[PDB]
Amino acid sequence: TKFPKFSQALAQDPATRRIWYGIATAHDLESHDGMTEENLYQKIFASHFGHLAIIFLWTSGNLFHVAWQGNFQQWVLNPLKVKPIAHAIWDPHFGQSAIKAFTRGGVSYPVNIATSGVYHWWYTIGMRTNEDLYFGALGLLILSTALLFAGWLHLQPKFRPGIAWFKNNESRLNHHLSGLFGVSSLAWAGHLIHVAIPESRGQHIRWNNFTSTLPHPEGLTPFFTGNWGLYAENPDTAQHIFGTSEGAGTAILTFLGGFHPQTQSMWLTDIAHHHLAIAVVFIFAGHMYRTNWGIGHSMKEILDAHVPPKGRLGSGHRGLFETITDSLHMQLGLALASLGVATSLVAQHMYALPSYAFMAKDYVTQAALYTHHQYIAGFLMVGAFAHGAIFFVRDYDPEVNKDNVLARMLQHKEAIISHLSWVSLFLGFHTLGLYIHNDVCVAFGTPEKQILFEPVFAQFIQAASGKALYGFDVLLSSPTSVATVAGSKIWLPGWVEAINSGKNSLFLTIGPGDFLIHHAIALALHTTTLILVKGALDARGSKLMPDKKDFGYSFPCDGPGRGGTCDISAWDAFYLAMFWMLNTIGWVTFYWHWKHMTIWGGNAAAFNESSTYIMGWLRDYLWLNSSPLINGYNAFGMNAQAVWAWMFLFGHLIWATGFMFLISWRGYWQELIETLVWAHERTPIANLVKWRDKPVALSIVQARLVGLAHFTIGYIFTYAPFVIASTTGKFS
C-alpha cells in the first residue's frame, strides 16, 4: 500500500523515482493496475465533474475579487481613463516605496491593474454595480458545489453509469448540439435581448423586474404574426452613447454590421441576432442522429458506406466508427485539434472585430488576450497530435483497419514525411535567404536592393472583402459588382465604412514585411506539423526500430546499438515539437505586437520600413520597447512595473535553467549523486539522519520533461512581462 497504489511496480521501486513516476502517471488511468474499461470511464466522468467545479470556482473568485477589491463602479463612469483593478496586494516584503508605487487606480491600498478584459466583458453584458458581481460569484459558487456533489454521487454504486451508456454516441451528440450548443446560445440571445441591450440603452433590468419589463414595445405579437422586421426597425443611431438613453433605438435583432461608433465594438443587437440564428441552426443540427425513435442517422452506417468507387480511398471509412468509439485517445485528439483551431479563431477574431465596449482603446488587454489565446491554441494543437500518436501506438488495430483510410496514411507515411520535409526546407531556405539578403543590403547602406515582395494575394482578398486603398476594384470593392448589389441593403453599408476606416484593426494594411513574416509563420507551422506527423506515424515502428509499439509511447531509448537510438519513442517527438510550437507562437505574437504597437503610435512607417530585416526586428521592437520594462526598478528608484521587471528576469532564469536538463544528461548526475551519497553516509552526526528512498538521478524521460517545462515556463514568464509592461509604459 505504497503511494503509487495504482502501480505495483512503482510501489516496489526503492529509489526516489517512485514519487516522480507516481505523480506523473497518476492520471494515466488506462495503464493502471487492475483497471477495467467501465471503471476507467466512470473515473473519467468524476474527474470531469471536479474539473468543471474548478473552472466555476476560478470564475467566481475573479468576480468576487473584482467586486470586493476592484474599482468597478468608478470604472463604469469613466471606462477610458480609470484603470481596472484586479485584486489587492498583501505582501509583508513590500517597502514603503513599493506600497506608494502600487497604490493606484483611485484606491487607498496597493492593487494590480487587470489585463484580462473582464471589466469590459461584464460592462458589455450589463453588470453595473459590485452587488451584481457578488451575486454572480455566489451563483457560481453554488454551481461548483452542485458539480462537486454530482461528481461524488456518480461514483456511488447505484449511480455509476454503464459502458453502453458512455458509448452511446448518437444521444450524446444530439444533446450536446441541440441543448449544450443550441439552447445555451438561445439562452444567451435571450439574456442579451432582455438585460444587455436595455442596459446599454439606459434601463436597469434585473431579476426583480425583468418579468414586468418588455424587451420590445410590441412584445411577441410581431413574432407570432410573422412581422419579424418590426424587431429590426428603428436601430441604434450613430450618435448613441453606450449606457445612456440618448440616441437609443428600439430594435432588438438587427444586421447593421460594422461597429458601434462610440465604443468601436459590434452592435449588441447584431450579437443577439447572431446567437439566435446560430442557436436555431444548432437545434436543427442536433436532430440528425437516431436515438430511441426511428428517425435519424446511424454513424456506423454512414462511415461504413462512405467509400468512393474503384477503391480510390482503399476500403473507405470502414472500421473508423469502431476505432473512434473504442479508443479514447483518438476522441481526445480530435477534440483537442478542434479546440485548438477554435482558440486560434477567437484569437484572430477578437482583435479584428472587438465585441466588448471600449476594449479597442485598451491596448494592454488586447495584446494580453491575443497572446494568451494563441499560446493556448498552440498547446492544444500539440496535445491533439500527441494523443493521435498515443492512439496509433496504443489503440490502433490493423485488423479492424484492414485497408482503411486511416491505414493508407501509414501506407504512404514516407511520402507524407518527405513532402513535409521538402516544404519546410524550401520555406526556411528562401525565407531566411531573403531576410539575410535584406539585412546585408541595408547593412551596406543600399536598401534599394532589397527583395520586397508585395502580398498581392492577401491584398486581393482584402479588396474582395471591401478594402479600397489597394485599387484592385474586385467584388465588394467594385461598386458595380453583383455581390455588392446583393449585399447593399443588409450589412455592407456598415461593413464598408468599418473596413475602410483607418482607425481600426479590421483587415490591417499589409506589405513586404507581412509577406516575409507570413512565410516564416508558414515555415514554422509546416515544421511543427512535420515533427508531430513523423512522431505519430513512426510511433508504431521504424526501420531503426520496427517493434517500437512493444516498447510503447514514452521509453528512453533502445541503447547505443545500431549507431544510437536517442529520442526515438515518439514522445520525444512531442518534446521536440514543443520547441517549434513555442517558436511559431512567439513569431506570431512578435508580429502582432509590433504591427499593433506601431499603428497605435501612428508610426506604421516604422514597421513598413524596418520589418523587412532581422536587424530592424531586433532593434526597433525588442531593444526599443524593452526600456520601460528593464527600467521598472533601477538604482534611483522603482515604479509599478518593478514586478514586471522582476518577472522578466525570473522567466529568463527559468528558461536558462531548462538548458541544464536539456543539455546535461543522466550519467554525470548519477555519479555526482553517488559521491554525495558517500559523503552523507560517511560524515558523522548527519549520518544518523538517513533517507528512506535511495536518491538517484532523474530518469531520461523525467529530465526531458523537466527541461521542457523549464523552457516553456521561462518562455511564457519572460514574454508576458514584456508584452504587458512595454504596452503599459508606452500606452500605445
Partner: peptide, 30 residues
Amino acid sequence: MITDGQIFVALCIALTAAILAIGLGRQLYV
C-alpha cells in the same frame, strides 16, 4: 460596497464546497 456579512456567507459557501471537494477526492481515490 460588499459587506462583511456578504463576505462571510460567501466564505461559508466556499467551506461547503471544500467539504464536498474533499469527499469527491476521497471517492476518486477509492
